[PDB]
């Protein structure tokens, strides 16, 4: 993968090129207002060392931070999300994989249309990387999910169990 981050809007200002995970952009970039993704799927992070608000970017050009749904121009670390050959996630009504369960292998823009629960209290990412969104149609707070067990919503870094949509991390 390759991403170019720019300090100012419309691909102007001081810039920095990443080919891999960077836990600390602070010495190189004082803010980020535009970005060009040549290749790979990237997660940008408000704070250093992959913490604070998260933003998913794919191949393409972002002329201002609003285009990746950024709330500010703070980008202090970034992750190249590894390629996955296949995608499967189980969502559960309750903590520790109890209650009603639904399994997805494809993107879902409205979770409540398939699974009549506003809150997801645990999930199992069996295959691939996903992005959980707080709201329907891929809006609100974003949480990157990599393969693993998530026995409660804190495990995916959320302050609540609100989930409205989710998407596979895929290029194409």
Residue numbers in the entry: 1 to 172
Question: What did the publication describing this PDB structure actually write?
Answer:
UV-lability of the Cys-DTT disulfide was tested by exposing similarly aged crystals to a UV LED at 285 nm during X-ray data collection. In the first 5 ms dataset, DTT adduct cleavage is visible at C41 and C108 in both chains, with oxidation to sulfenic acid observed at C41 in both chains. We show that UV exposure is then able to disrupt the disulfide bond, and partially restore the conformation to that of fresh crystallin. However, with continuous illumination we observe the formation of sulfenic acid at C41, cysteine at C108 and no obvious changes to the structure of the neighboring tryptophans W42 and W130 in both copies of HGDm in the asymmetric unit. No evidence of these modifications was observed in the electron density of the light structure nor was it possible to locate the liberated DTT. The analysis of atomic coordinate-derived conformational space (RoPE, described in Methods Section 4.6), show that while aging of the crystal produces a large shift in the conformational space, this is partially reversed by UV exposure. The corresponding interatomic distance plots also show a reversal of the conformational changes that occurred during aging for each chain. However, total reversal is precluded perhaps due to the rate of structural relaxation and oxidation of C41 to sulfenic acid, although a much smaller covalent modification, may continue to influence the conformation. In support of this, we have shown that after UV illumination of aged crystals, HGDm returns at least in part to the original conformational state of fresh protein. Hence, disulfide cleavage likely proceeds in the most part via tryptophan excitation.
Human gamma-D crystallin (HGD) is a soluble, monomeric protein expressed in the eye lens during fetal development. The high expression levels contribute to the refractive index within the lens which focuses visible light upon the retina. However, this halts further expression of HGD. This means HGD must remain correctly folded and soluble for the entire human lifespan in order to maintain visual acuity. In order to observe structural changes in HGD, we take advantage of an arginine-to-serine point mutation, R36S, first identified in congenital cataracts (HGDm).
